[PDB]
Structures are given as structure tokens and as C-alpha cells.
Amino acid sequence: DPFYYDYETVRNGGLIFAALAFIVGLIIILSK
Amino acid sequence: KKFIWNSEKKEFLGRTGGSWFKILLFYVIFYGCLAGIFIGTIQVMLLTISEFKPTYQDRVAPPGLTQIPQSQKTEISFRPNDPQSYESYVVSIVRFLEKYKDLAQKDDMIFEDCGNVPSELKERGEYNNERGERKVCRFRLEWLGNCSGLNDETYGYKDGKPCVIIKLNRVLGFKPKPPKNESLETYPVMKYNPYVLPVHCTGKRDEDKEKVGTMEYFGLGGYPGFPLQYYPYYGKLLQPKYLQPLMAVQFTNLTMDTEIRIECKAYGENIGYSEKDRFQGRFDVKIEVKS
Amino acid sequence: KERDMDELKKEVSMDDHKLSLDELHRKYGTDLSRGLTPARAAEILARDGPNALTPPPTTPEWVKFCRQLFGGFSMLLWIGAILCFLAYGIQAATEEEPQNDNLYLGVVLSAVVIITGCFSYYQEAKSSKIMESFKNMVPQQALVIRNGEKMSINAEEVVVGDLVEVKGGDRIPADLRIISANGCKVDNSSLTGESEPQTRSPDFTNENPLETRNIAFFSTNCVEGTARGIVVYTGDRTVMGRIATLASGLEGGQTPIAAEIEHFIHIITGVAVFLGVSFFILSLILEYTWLEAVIFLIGIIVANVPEGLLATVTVCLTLTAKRMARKNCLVKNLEAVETLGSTSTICSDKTGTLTQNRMTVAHMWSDNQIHEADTTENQSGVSFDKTSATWLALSRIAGLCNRAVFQANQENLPILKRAVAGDASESALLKCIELCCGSVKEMRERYTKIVEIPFNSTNKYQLSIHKNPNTAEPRHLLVMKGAPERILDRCSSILIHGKEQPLDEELKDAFQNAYLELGGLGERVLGFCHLFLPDEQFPEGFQFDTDDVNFPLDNLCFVGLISMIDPPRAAVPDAVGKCRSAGIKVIMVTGDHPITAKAIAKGVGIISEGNETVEDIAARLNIPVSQVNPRDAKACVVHGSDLKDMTSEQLDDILKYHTEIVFARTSPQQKLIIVEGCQRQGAIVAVTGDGVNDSPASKKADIGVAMGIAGSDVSKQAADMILLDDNFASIVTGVEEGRLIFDNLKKSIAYTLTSNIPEITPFLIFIIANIPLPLGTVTILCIDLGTDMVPAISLAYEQAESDIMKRQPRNPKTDKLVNEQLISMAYGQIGMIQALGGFFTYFVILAENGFLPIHLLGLRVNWDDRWINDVEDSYGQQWTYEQRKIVEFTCHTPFFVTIVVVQWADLVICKTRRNSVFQQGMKNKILIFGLFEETALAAFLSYCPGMGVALRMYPLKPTWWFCAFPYSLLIFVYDEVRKLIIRRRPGGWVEKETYY
Ligand SMILES: C[C@@H]1O[C@@H](O[C@H]2C[C@@H](O)[C@]3(CO)[C@H]4[C@H](O)C[C@]5(C)[C@@H](C6=CC(=O)OC6)CC[C@]5(O)[C@@H]4CC[C@]3(O)C2)[C@H](O)[C@H](OC(=O)c2c3ccccc3cc3ccccc23)[C@H]1O
Ligand SMILES: *[C@@H]1O[C@H](CO)[C@@H](O[C@@H]2O[C@H](CO)[C@@H](O)[C@H](O)[C@H]2NC(C)=O)[C@H](O)[C@H]1NC(C)=O
Ligand SMILES: CC(C)CCC[C@@H](C)[C@H]1CC[C@H]2[C@@H]3CC=C4C[C@@H](O)CC[C@]4(C)[C@H]3CC[C@]12C
Ligand SMILES: CC(C)CCC[C@@H](C)[C@H]1CC[C@H]2[C@@H]3CC=C4C[C@@H](O)CC[C@]4(C)[C@H]3CC[C@]12C
Ligand SMILES: CC(C)CCC[C@@H](C)[C@H]1CC[C@H]2[C@@H]3CC=C4C[C@@H](O)CC[C@]4(C)[C@H]3CC[C@]12C
Ligand SMILES: *[C@@H]1O[C@H](CO)[C@@H](O)[C@H](O)[C@H]1NC(C)=O
Ligand SMILES: [Mg+2]
Ligand SMILES: [Mg+2]
Numbered sequence A: 001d002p003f004y005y006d007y008e009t010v011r012n013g014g015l016i017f018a019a020l021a022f023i024v025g026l027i028i029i030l031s032k
Numbered sequence B: 001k002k003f004i005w006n007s008e009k010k011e012f013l014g015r016t017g018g019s020w021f022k023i024l025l026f027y028v029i030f031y032g033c034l035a036g037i038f039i040g041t042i043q044v045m046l047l048t049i050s051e052f053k054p055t056y057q058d059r060v061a062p063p064g065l066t067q068i069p070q071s072q073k074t075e076i077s078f079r080p081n082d083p084q085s086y087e088s089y090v091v092s093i094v095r096f097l098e099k100y101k102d103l104a105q106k107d108d109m110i111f112e113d114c115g116n117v118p119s120e121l122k123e124r125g126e127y128n129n130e131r132g133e134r135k136v137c138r139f140r141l142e143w144l145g146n147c148s149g150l151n152d153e154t155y156g157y158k159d160g161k162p163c164v165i166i167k168l169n170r171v172l173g174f175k176p177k178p179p180k181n182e183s184l185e186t187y188p189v190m191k192y193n194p195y196v197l198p199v200h201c202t203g204k205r206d207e208d209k210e211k212v213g214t215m216e217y218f219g220l221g222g223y224p225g226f227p228l229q230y231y232p233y234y235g236k237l238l239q240p241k242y243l244q245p246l247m248a249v250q251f252t253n254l255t256m257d258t259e260i261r262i263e264c265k266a267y268g269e270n271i272g273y274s275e276k277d278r279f280q281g282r283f284d285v286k287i288e289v290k291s
Numbered sequence C: 001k002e003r004d005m006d007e008l009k010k011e012v013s014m015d016d017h018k019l020s021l022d023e024l025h026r027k028y029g030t031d032l033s034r035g036l037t038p039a040r041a042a043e044i045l046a047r048d049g050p051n052a053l054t055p056p057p058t059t060p061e062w063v064k065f066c067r068q069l070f071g072g073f074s075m076l077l078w079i080g081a082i083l084c085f086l087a088y089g090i091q092a093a094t095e096e097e098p099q100n101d102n103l104y105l106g107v108v109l110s111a112v113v114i115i116t117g118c119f120s121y122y123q124e125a126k127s128s129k130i131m132e133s134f135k136n137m138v139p140q141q142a143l144v145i146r147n148g149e150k151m152s153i154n155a156e157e158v159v160v161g162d163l164v165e166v167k168g169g170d171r172i173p174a175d176l177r178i179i180s181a182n183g184c185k186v187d188n189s190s191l192t193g194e195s196e197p198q199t200r201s202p203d204f205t206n207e208n209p210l211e212t213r214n215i216a217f218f219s220t221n222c223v224e225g226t227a228r229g230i231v232v233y234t235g236d237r238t239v240m241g242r243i244a245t246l247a248s249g250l251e252g253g254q255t256p257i258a259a260e261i262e263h264f265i266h267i268i269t270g271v272a273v274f275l276g277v278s279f280f281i282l283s284l285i286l287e288y289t290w291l292e293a294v295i296f297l298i299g300i301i302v303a304n305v306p307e308g309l310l311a312t313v314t315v316c317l318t319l320t321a322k323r324m325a326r327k328n329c330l331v332k333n334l335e336a337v338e339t340l341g342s343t344s345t346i347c348s349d350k351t352g353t354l355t356q357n358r359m360t361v362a363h364m365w366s367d368n369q370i371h372e373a374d375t376t377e378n379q380s381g382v383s384f385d386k387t388s389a390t391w392l393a394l395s396r397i398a399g400l401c402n403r404a405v406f407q408a409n410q411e412n413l414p415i416l417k418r419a420v421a422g423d424a425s426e427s428a429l430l431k432c433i434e435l436c437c438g439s440v441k442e443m444r445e446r447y448t449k450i451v452e453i454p455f456n457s458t459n460k461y462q463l464s465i466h467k468n469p470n471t472a473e474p475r476h477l478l479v480m481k482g483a484p485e486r487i488l489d490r491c492s493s494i495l496i497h498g499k500e501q502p503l504d505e506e507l508k509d510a511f512q513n514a515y516l517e518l519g520g521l522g523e524r525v526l527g528f529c530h531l532f533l534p535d536e537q538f539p540e541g542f543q544f545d546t547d548d549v550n551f552p553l554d555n556l557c558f559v560g561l562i563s564m565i566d567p568p569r570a571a572v573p574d575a576v577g578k579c580r581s582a583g584i585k586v587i588m589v590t591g592d593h594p595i596t597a598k599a600i601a602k603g604v605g606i607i608s609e610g611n612e613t614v615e616d617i618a619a620r621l622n623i624p625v626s627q628v629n630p631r632d633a634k635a636c637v638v639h640g641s642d643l644k645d646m647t648s649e650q651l652d653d654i655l656k657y658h659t660e661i662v663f664a665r666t667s668p669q670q671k672l673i674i675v676e677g678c679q680r681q682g683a684i685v686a687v688t689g690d691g692v693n694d695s696p697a698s699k700k701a702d703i704g705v706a707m708g709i710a711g712s713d714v715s716k717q718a719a720d721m722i723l724l725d726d727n728f729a730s731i732v733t734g735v736e737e738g739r740l741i742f743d744n745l746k747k748s749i750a751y752t753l754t755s756n757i758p759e760i761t762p763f764l765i766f767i768i769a770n771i772p773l774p775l776g777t778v779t780i781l782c783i784d785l786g787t788d789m790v791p792a793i794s795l796a797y798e799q800a801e802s803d804i805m806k807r808q809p810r811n812p813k814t815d816k817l818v819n820e821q822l823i824s825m826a827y828g829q830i831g832m833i834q835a836l837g838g839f840f841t842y843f844v845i846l847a848e849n850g851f852l853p854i855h856l857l858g859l860r861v862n863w864d865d866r867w868i869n870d871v872e873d874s875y876g877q878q879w880t881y882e883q884r885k886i887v888e889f890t891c892h893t894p895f896f897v898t899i900v901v902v903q904w905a906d907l908v909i910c911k912t913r914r915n916s917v918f919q920q921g922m923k924n925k926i927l928i929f930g931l932f933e934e935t936a937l938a939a940f941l942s943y944c945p946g947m948g949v950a951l952r953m954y955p956l957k958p959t960w961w962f963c964a965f966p967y968s969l970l971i972f973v974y975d976e977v978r979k980l981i982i983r984r985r986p987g988g989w990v991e992k993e994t995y996y
């Protein structure tokens, strides 16, 4: 049915992106 | 300290004359480009969506359940004698059913006589514009017995024992699916289970359920629900002047001078509910016939 | 009537020093040889108070907490929170179950103010704590003679009028009246500023109670000799005591950075109330009642206040101040970190601040050639020439004929910073031999001394006969030193290139010109000579005389001269040059003799070569000074004696028409007059001092700079910046950091002010066109107090776009921190594009869900209704309350994300003011972290499970993130071409409007 959105997949993708972007920023600020 | 009015350098409000035209002209050009750009983006955005279908319909998954007397707080308080006390209700009911009169649905090129018995779903091809303007099945006020419009008794539904019809939220491409075998709440209200969406009203607690004496429902052929022959919806563009099904509910033995709560819950598989939205699927009303 | 007490303390002091010994003992009633009876002590100790300055006024802990709680910036947020509570009361008294939006906003603003005050208090308290860990002053008792018996009692137990004996090495307890001295040379460095130790003579010499030698002062150390004296003043009644209490009673003033912050707040409130009133009239003009219009007015003004800008500016100033503290440039005032960058006139002290306050061997004369010894503090200067035998002869005369040496604990301490007992000159000679000729410990005993003759008043000479070293066999060495003009007369032989020559006038006058050359250079010359007593005519064993002089006073062999003076600090000359490079007018304010001040000024950079004074031109023309025109002289020496008889207008005439000014013999009170004269011109002043004479000058000035170790405690407390390492270069670092943080403040402020347009505009058109709310309140809080916190902070780590140390100091009345150009950019151009991008995302989401943009006109009326659950869209579908409301919240969250998207480009463009982003480069690691953290934080605020229920920020469909991308790229491209046009066309319009 067109009245259903896989919100779990998009929500999970957003969480994964947030985690990756945050750790990458930390890598840039904690450069060695 | 606020005498920035003028100066010997021809200053007004702070700057010179030749400076105001320069700044104003730049802001006019700049803001004009900004407006044209925003409009240019919004135009391609209008080209993204289609005319026969909303690109997103998940936010309307569980259809609602509204009523004819759109009360300020879903409460119907009036006097069985004073005609002006219930004028706000009757006015809304008449304006609602004004598009359902036999004279309103007279053109046969846009209306189709479905039938006196609820039948299966009527799919009019795909949602594209390859076909012409789809037909809309008629729905006469006579189906809502004892709560009819202006036919023989423009009763106003209020001389004691009022009427409150319910309506299913019109959703495009939505195909209602009534329940089946697993019936923990499906009461024997009516035999017609397969081609009608059942809706049952009740109290809310041990008090309201006792105060509300008897409820009489009216629908297509006498079934308390919505016939499947009127769905799915094909949008306002392809189906103008569409008349969604209606179903009336009357409360005969009510406890006058007592505010009682009623919950009209619509049952079905494609009908969801929500503890945050008291209108998704179910429906509430606070009736008080104070004499 | 405290206005008169302050002036009484400002007036020069007077005394009763010029009194006969009988008159002096009559005024106080004290024996000249036995002091006073012990019972007489309790009659004065418990009468006026113990001999100690009254501790400075104490300001309790919670006072600073409330000081930062109110402030000037926190007041804007306090009034915002008050308006929030007022609007909430007006909103609660009209509707049924109300909404908690305004209450949360009010408590948030209150917490913001409290958080800023707490952070500021923590930083300032940490500064004061580490400062307390460095001022561990220990009591120093006095040697008082009472009842005819010597007794060492605490300094606080000393009273007025009791004989006190100060030994060479003891600190002068209180102000004394010398009655019997034996060559005592007190060090009046911390009080008056006289570099060379001034001798104290019991007889009255000068009318001025300071220049006179019959007065000992508080906080002064007895370099050498011994002396006796009657206590004249005690406790706060002392000279330096009155100067300290005057420093405690002066006004600090308004710092330039705080004034800029206030002007910024004034403009912020200007647009806030302007938009609130204009929109109030418009809101009423359309269809809203007075009751709703007041709510609007308050919402427009409150929403127009930058909440998160307070914490960002605070941490901004804190970060720069921390970089200052790393370089020992401690700042007690959190906002005084910028004050240096705006300074345009530095009034410095000579003794202690510019110089090291240590008599050091500067030049020497040997073999008819001046030899400049290194005068650095860390021993990093050019090394003199030491290869001839005359150097060894001079080194022997200096290292041998010297009264004393170093002390006990002075073993691990460096050769320069170690204490030495004796005169200031002998200590210099000792250090020079210990640094250039090996050691003096084994060199003095190796030449056993037999008969030594100390300095004399009549027939002034200082000589000593020693024994002979390793086999050479001359058997005797008679060394002598003294005034060059006196030692030259009693000399016949002259050492040159190793051999001896006669006293021929040819090479004899070569010594006279060297003496006048070293004297005119501002140094103290001393002649040294020696003679080998022939052991064939004078016995090799015991043959000496002391009453009827036997050693030949004449026919000695002259070796050379040895000049000395307190040299300037290592980095002082380069620092003065760097300050003059940026356009800072260097003015010397000291209390030393003009003879030394002019030389030090010419040596550090305050007086360059070529510029002549009113006296130098007259001497060059052999004409009286009253004939030359003062306009012909670029520099001038201002005598303190002539400044006392000067008015307020004449001082301005001296400061305007003269670039290089040197104020000599200026009392501590006159320094304040000079500072006020410099402030009358409207320029920012900075005073750098070390002694107690600089306390009122370092207090009244916009910023005081004290020496961590070479600065007295009084002036160290009255100042605003402490130099722990005494590195005068810290001044250069401070001015650089001040201007750097000023520019970064402009950038950070513009970044926070740009976000206000896409923040208020949704609520504005929400009322204008009656469309559903495009942006919520919670989201705005997640923007100003959320994402944008790190970008505004990282904008403080930005670095110079050009050579900041090359431009002139900013004008306080011309170059404003937040001018109208910044507002024209944020509220006018950039913010407008950000708002357009937000509205684009709004319509994109609503139209894709079935609510086309056209249909949104006038839909708010039934959109906010909690009971109309049949709202029809553009397709004919009916939406319930929670359904369309979920769409509204899932339309608010992407608006916040849209703000982040446009903030990317806003941060990149605000990172540079004139240069291109590629010319500067995004090397700011903190800025890149800010972009990644801001993006991740927003993504978390939207995709976290339970956000649609806690903050009502539902997840976003991925295709929404790309809605604001073209707008951000446009912001970047537009501002990039803007700065490029300002770079290639630094003319008018593109520079007078955009450039902020
Ligand atoms: C025009 C109004 O529009 C709507 O509200 C808007 C305006 C305002 O009321 C807001 C309340 O805080 C404003 C606020 O003012 C400004 C803010 C704090 C401002 C900011 C400043 C800042 O620093 O950051 C952000 C931006 C917007 C803001 O964040 C809030 C957001 C929430 C608002 O609720 C939004 C309502 O429909 C309102 O109606 C009713 O409230 C209403 C009734 C009123 C009277 C009597 C009977 C009623 C019965 C009702 C029954 C059921 C439902 C409503 C009833 C309209 O009057
Ligand atoms: C429709 O209206 C009629 C009135 O003409 C209703 O008649 C009811 O008849 C029953 C049986 O005698 C009585 O108990 C009720 O009191 C009557 N109602 C009224 C309002 O008078 C009739 O029941 C109504 N409903 C239907 C389904 O016909
Ligand atoms: C200098 C500029 C171009 C940097 C642009 C950064 C782009 C490439 C990054 C920044 C944030 C990112 C988005 C972060 C959040 C989401 C939601 C998620 O459910 C799918 C991925 C998606 C849609 C990401 C796509 C890539 C993205 C848009
Ligand atoms: C919905 C839309 C039309 C409202 C947006 C507000 C616009 C029109 C307002 C907001 C702030 C305003 C600007 C504020 C600052 C400046 C700089 C000043 O020296 C001249 C006026 C000028 C250039 C204003 C022009 C009008 C302006 C840009
Ligand atoms: C001369 C050139 C640069 C102008 C071309 C205009 C471009 C940059 C504009 C025109 C219409 C815009 C698009 C309109 C529709 C959509 C779909 C939506 O779900 C995300 C935004 C997105 C993808 C927009 C991105 C930017 C866009 C493609
Ligand atoms: C209401 O009337 C009906 C009539 O059939 C009766 O059965 C019922 O018990 C009554 N209820 C109350 C609460 O009066
Ligand atoms: Mg804000
Ligand atoms: Mg000094």
C-alpha cells in the first residue's frame, strides 16, 4: 500500500550518519 | 541624541540623499533576484508532484471519524424546547447535507446509481488522466432513516433524542478492509460483515455506558457502516463533487440533564487507532440534553 | 565629601624633615641615642594602629557571582526572560489549557544568564587563585633601639618616633628621618623611581622630601652602609602608604570592549523594537485584536534577541585570554584581554619596567678602545673582546679590589639573578668577572690581601695591596679605583696592548673623550689602575703603612675605565619598535633623573636618531634654548619640576605637538595627571609599571601591566594584567591577540545575527499570510543554543587575514565593533537568503504531502483548531488534528535542518572578512569540527527514537536534506564574489556598505 513509509530504515540511516559524522569530526579535532 | 534628523552633509535619518537611492536600488535588485530565485525553485518543485496523487500518504494511514455537528469541544448541549439553543447544530447539519439532496445529484454524466445493497469495491481503472472524469456513486438522504434531511420531516433532529451522523475521512486510493474471523470486539449489531465497514458506538466507562440507554444506527440498506461500493477515492481533480458514505446514529433513551460521553469506534483491519489522536479510527462526543 | 579626600591624596606631599636634631626630638619627644622607654611603645601602638598598611577592601565571593549575573549583556537576556513570563501571564489569562512554550523559553533565558555568570566567575576566580599562590609575602621585622638596648621587633610593632637602626641589607620599615649615617645608600626604586641607589645623609639636602637624603621611605631596601633615624610616619601615613590608599580609591572606568558590547546591544534592541512595533501596527491593521497584537509585539522583540551569543562571546574572550595565560600574560579582568588591541598610546615606566633595575657593567675602556659588554638578562648578547693582557689587568683590579661577594644560598642561582652583599657597583663588577673572566671566589683569595684602604671623604681613594700570584716575581700588586678624573691624576704609566707607556697627553686626552662619551651615554664610569711595587727597593715580606701612607699614591699604571648602568630588558628595544610599527605612541613616564632617562629613551626606541630636543638644537647652535622654536624639535624632555607648575591646556600642547615625550622626575601623583592628559585626547592608554609609584597610573589607565616578580604588590593588585615572566614582549603578544580577537568577535557576532532572519521570518509570515507555522520554538532553541554554538565558538580560533601589527590602532569613535554594515549584511542579505531556503523546504514538504503552497493561504485558522478533524487538502483528502500537526512538526524539524544547511555557507563566508576562503584556507580545525558536530547533532535531533514525542521533532525523509543545498551554495558564491570585488576594487560602494 502507498500509505506506508519505512520510517525505521530512514531513521536508522540517520542515526548511522550522525554517529559516523560525529566520530569523523572528533578525528579531525583530535588529530595526531 | 536623536537629532540624526539632518546635518550639513544633507543627511536624512542618518545618511545622504544620493546614498538612499543607491542602497534602495541595490536592495530592490537583490531582493528581486531573491524572489525570482525562490519562485524558480518553487516552480520546479510544483513540477515534481503530480496532479492525480500526493507523493506521500503515510501521514494519513489511519483514517479519521468525524461528525456533522462540529462542536467547539465535541459536546452537544442544548434545550429540547428552545429552538435557538440547537440552531448552531442544525445549521451545520443542513449545510453538510445540502450537497446530498436529490436535486444536487441530478446529472447522469457524473453520477452513477450504485444500488440499494452494499456491494464490492468499484475500481475505475488507474489514477492517471488517460480516462475521462470518473463517476461518483450517488448517496440519497433517504438511506439515513429517521435522520434524513429535508424530505418529509425537517425535524432538525432535536425534539428530544438527537441524531449524530459519522463520516469516514476521505482518503485517496484508500480501500477499506472490514474485519474477519478474529472477532474479540465485533458485536452482532448487523449480519452484513463483508461489504461494509462497521462502526459501533458505546459509552466510555461504567457510568456513561449505563446512562446511554439505546442507540439506533442507520446506513445503506440499514447497516451501521460504510458501503465498499463508494471506495477508493480518486482525488478532487478526477472526482469532483464526490459524496463519501454517511451513517447516522441516534440515542433514544438518554438521561436528560446529564453530560455523558460516547465513543464511536470504527472497526477494520485498515483502520488504525492512536492514544494521542482521539479521532484516528475512533470518535468521541459529550451529549447533554438539559431541559 | 570623598571627592575632596581623593584630591588631598592627589596633591604632592610635604614634610618637616628640615628641622634641627633638637627640633626633631622636640616635635616627637624621643631620645636621640636611647630611643624611648618600652612603656612609651604601647602608648603609640594602641593609639593610631600597628605599623602596617590597612589591608585593601574585601569584596566577598558571592559579589562576583552577582556582578556577572547582572552585567550589560546579561541584562538583555534578563529582560527577555521577564518579557517571556509577562507574555505567558497574558497568554494564560485568556485561553483554557494553555501551551508550555513561553514558560520553557523564560526558564531557558534565565539559565543562560546564570550559566554565563558561572563560567565567567570560574575563570576570574581561577586567575585570582593562581595569583594568590604567588604573593606569599613574609613579615620583615625592624631593629629598634629602645631603653638604650637593641631589640628586633616586628614591623607592625614599630611606632612613631623611636630610634631605628637600619643595617646594610635590611628593608626600611617605616618612613625615617636620618640622624646618623655611614655611607648608607637606600634603594628608592619602588617608591620614587631613582635607578641608581641614592645615598642617605643626615643633613637636609633638597626641599623636596623625596629628593632629599635625610629621609628613609617605606618599602625601600638599604643597599649598603648603615644609618640611624627617628620614625616620622607610620602605617598608612607613610609616603607609599598614601600612594597605595590613593590607588584603592580610584575609578577603574569603562573598558573599550565593554563599551563596544553595549553599543552592540543598543543596535540589537533598536531593530528588535523597530520590527516589533512595525509588526505590531501591521498585525493590528490586518485582523488581530489588541490582545493578540501585544503577544505578537513581545514575541517579535524576544525572538530578535541573540540568546546563544552571550555564551559564545564569553568563551570567545576566555579562549583568547587562555592563550594569553599560556604565555604568562595573566589577565584578572576577563574583558581586559582585548584592551591592548585598541590601545594607541602606551605610557611606560623606566626603572623596573623598561630596565632590569640592576646596575650592570655596560662598557669598558681598555687599550684606547671602547668595549661594550653584553647587557642582556639571559646572557644572549654580543660578546666583548678578551684576548689582550690589559683585559686581565682590568679584571684583576675589579675582582680583587672589591669589598664583598655573593651570599650563602646564592649557589644554584644564575650569575645575574643572584643576590650580592655590598654596593650596586661592586655587585656589577663581581658579575662581570664571574661571567667573562671565570670566577672570583678563587681569584680573590689567591692574591692574599694585607692592608686595604676603603673609600674616603677627603683625598677620595679606594685601594688595596695584595700578594703576588704564580711565579712572575714582582712580589706586590697595589690596586686602586675611583673617579676617572681623580685616578688619572695619580697615574703615570699606561697599559696598552700588553706593554707600558708614559702619560703622554696624546693618549691621555683619548681617555677624556672616552669618559665624556660614556657619561653622555647615560652610564657611571670608574677608573681602575694598578702598580707593581718593586721588591728590590721595598721589602718582600712585611713592609706597609696605614697612618703615614707608604705605598706610592702617584706613579701608578692606569688600565682602563669601567662604566655601568641599569640596562634595559632584552626584549624591550624590539618591543618598543614593534609597538611603534603598529602606530602606538610610546611615552616614558619615570621618576629618575633626566640624565639617565634621555639615554635609556634613546637606547630602547622612545627617541630615535635624528630627532633633537629643545635643548639638543640649542646646544648644536651654541645659542640659548629660549631662542629655538619648539616646533623644530620633534621630541622633548619634560622635567618633573616644571610639570608641577603646569595647567591642563599646556599638557595637551605638549602631547599634541610632540611625538616622542619623556617625563622625568615625575612623582607618583604626577603620573596620574599624565595619564589623564593622555585620556583627554580620546585615545586608549595602557600603563606598564612595576613600583608603587605606578599604582595610580596602572589603576586609572584603561589597562595596567605589572611585572610578576619585578613589580610591587600594590601596583600588582591595582593593575589589570600581570606578566609572570616579566617578558616585555608579552605586551606585543597582548596587543596582537587583542586586535585578533576583536576581528574574530565581529565575525562570530555576524554569524549569530544572521540566523535571526530565518528564525523570526517564519513566525512573521505565519501571522501575515495566515499559513501553518513553518518553524517552531523548540527548533529555534536547538539552533541558537544548539547547532550554532560550536560554529560561533570556533570563529575565535581564526587567524589574521593580513599583518594586524602593521595597521593603526582602531578609533573608538570611528571603528565600531558592530556597525551598520554588519546589520546590512546579516539582517539584509545573508539572513534573507537563509529565510528563503527555509520557506522552500516548508512548501516542499507540505506540497508533497498533498497541501500545495497555494492552498496554504489562510489555512492556519482551521489548522490550529484541535477539533476540526476534516481539513481538506489540494487533493480532497481529509486530515485530522494530530495528522496535520504531525506534518507541521515534521515540517519544523527540516526547517531547523535547513538553518544548519545555510549555516554551513554562512560560517564559511563569515570566516573571512576581506580575503577569499581559498586565500585564507579552512585550516581552522575547530571550524571543521564545528561543521561535522553541527550536522551530526541536527541529524540526531531528528532521527533519535522518541523525538517526535519528547521535543516533537519527527524524522525527516532523506530527500529533504537536499532542499536547502542550492541556497547554501548561492550564499557562498554571492559572498565570495562580494569579497572578491572588495579585494580587486577597494574603492567606495563595495567597501563602505558590505565590509563590516
Ligand atoms: C494568532 C495565534 O496563533 C496561534 O498561536 C501562535 C501565537 C502565540 O499564541 C504563541 C504562544 O507562545 C507564540 C508566541 O506568541 C511567540 C513565540 C514565543 C515566538 C518566539 C519568541 C522567541 O524568542 O523565540 C520564539 C515565535 C512563536 C512563539 O514561539 C510562540 C509559538 C506558539 C504560539 O501559540 C503560536 C494560536 O492559534 C493562537 O490561538 C490561541 O492561542 C487560542 C486562544 C487564544 C485566546 C483565547 C482562546 C483561545 C483558545 C484556543 C483554543 C485552541 C487553540 C488555541 C487557542 C492565536 O491567537
Ligand atoms: C422512525 O420514526 C418513527 C416515528 O414516526 C419511529 O416510531 C417509533 O415507534 C416505536 C414503536 O411503536 C416507539 O416505541 C417509538 O417511541 C417511536 N419513536 C418516535 C420518535 O415516536 C421509528 O422507530 C423511527 N425509527 C425507525 C427505524 O423506524
Ligand atoms: C560542502 C558541502 C557540499 C558538504 C555537503 C555534505 C553532504 C554531502 C552530507 C551532509 C549531511 C548528509 C546527510 C545527513 C542525513 C541524511 C539522512 C539519512 O536518512 C540519509 C543520508 C542523508 C541524506 C545525508 C546525505 C549526505 C549529506 C547531505
Ligand atoms: C517578508 C519581507 C518583505 C520582509 C523582509 C524584511 C526586509 C524588507 C527588511 C529587514 C531588514 C531591512 C534592512 C535593515 C538594514 C538596512 C541597512 C540600512 O543602512 C538601510 C536599510 C536596510 C537596507 C533595510 C532594508 C529593508 C530590510 C532588508
Ligand atoms: C542556473 C542553475 C544553477 C539553476 C538550476 C536550479 C537548481 C539549482 C534548482 C532548481 C529546482 C531545485 C530542486 C527542486 C526540487 C527538488 C526536490 C526536493 O525533494 C529536494 C530539492 C530539489 C532537488 C531542488 C534542488 C535545487 C534545484 C534543482
Ligand atoms: C432505556 O430504554 C430502554 C428501552 O428498551 C430500556 O431497555 C433501558 O433499560 C433504558 N435505560 C435507561 C438507563 O433508562
Ligand atoms: Mg536566536
Ligand atoms: Mg618602576
Ligand SMILES: [Mg+2]
Pocket: C252, C698, C699, C700, C701, C702, C703, C704, C718, C719, C720
Ligand atoms: Mg584598570
